[model samples]
Target: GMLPRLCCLEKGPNGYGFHLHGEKGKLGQYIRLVEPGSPAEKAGLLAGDRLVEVNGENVEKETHQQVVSRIRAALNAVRLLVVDPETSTTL
Candidate 1:
């Protein structure tokens, strides 16, 4: 099984350089459209990685918009608990 990943991404001058997609209670929110040579890439955030937590908050049950709000509310650093796409599909 694919193990979970902890993405420690610090906000760059241009932002995280990625977007969160998917819906709550569905496929769940996942990392999408990671820009090249960005913070997200450096952090090892891959497209389609399912988000499990944000900072320290459990976001598995949270909606997409809610998660987005939480991420934007961060100060500088953002810690994300995520699972690989293959592992996510097993759930």
Candidate 2:
């Protein structure tokens, strides 16, 4: 399937301003940090959100760089499927 982008924002002075993490041997990616007033923040991305998909493709086993590439490769919103860290569920 072709990569799709919808309508997300861009980075600010703090850089792309999003940090990602993965637990050792785990199969999920997590948002480690979101810089204040940054694109990630403006995009409604929050810290601790589990990254479940990119461009509608499952990303549980994708590497950090792979995810970043997916985000960068998008032509529009960088559609991301995320789960709330507190609820451990998607909305």
Candidate 3:
């Protein structure tokens, strides 16, 4: 299996300094707009990077809301496993 980008970021001025776009069973969740100069960008989280896991838990089959819940459950830190949809190979 190809390795995914591991982005562990601390809480930023506004949440995790990123946006979780897309939805469950549809396009799935993906990272959008990694705010500039924020923890997310500094941690290497990129836009268009599809969400594979959240806080060490697999969210590939989880809903967007479900994913968000876990993110909130995080302890001021978020561990995200992601991959580029356009450039990375399949799992």
Candidate 4:
């Protein structure tokens, strides 16, 4: 049900910019928006990429705030592995 893609977000003039949303059901946390011209957008994060991992830690079972916390803990940069919902297949 996931297609993982690595996204590296480094600190920029405005910081690593993006928004996340964790909805109910099997969808998991997703990238709700990517600020235009931001590091996230430049790194290729789309609006619906489902978040699977953050900094090598699995987030499939984590809460929304927990996931957000992990991302916020990063000092200068972060790496995210996401699944593009539009192109994923579930068994």
Top lDDT: which candidate number?
A: 1
Candidate 1 residue 36 Cα shift, in angstroms, is 0.4
Quote model 1's TM-score.
0.86
Best by TM-score: 1
Error of 2 at 31 (Å): 0.6
What lDDT would candidate 3 get against the real structure?
Answer: 0.83
Q: Write the per-residue lDDT of candidate 1 for residues 1-91, one digit (tens) a residue.
A: 3557889999999999998987655666888899999999999898988888899888887778888899998997899989876745534
Scored by CA lDDT, what does every candidate get? 0.85, 0.69, 0.83, 0.83
User: Which lDDT value does model 1 have at 86?
Assistant: 73
Question: Could you give the candidate ranking by TM-score, starting with the highest?
Answer: 1, 3, 4, 2
Q: At residue 12, give the lDDT of candidate 1.
A: 92
The window of 10 residues in a row where model 4 has the poorest summed lDDT is 82-91
Candidate 4 positional error at 3, Å: 6.7
Pairs with steric clashes in candidate 1: none
TM-score, candidate number 4: 0.84
After superposition, the stretches of candidate 1 with alpha carbons farther than 4 Å from their true spots are 1-3, 89-91
Q: After TM-score superposition, what is the CA distance of residue 69 in candidate 3 from its true location, in Å?
A: 0.2
Instruction: Write one digit per residue (lDDT tens) for candidate 4, span 1-91.
Output: 3447789999798767888887668656989768889999888888888888899998878899998899888897889998877877444
TM value for model 2: 0.68
Whichever of 2 and 4 has more TM-score, that candidate is: 4
Provide the RMSD of all predictions against the true structure, rounded to 1 decimal: 2.2, 5.9, 2.3, 2.8
The better candidate by lDDT, 2 or 4, is 4
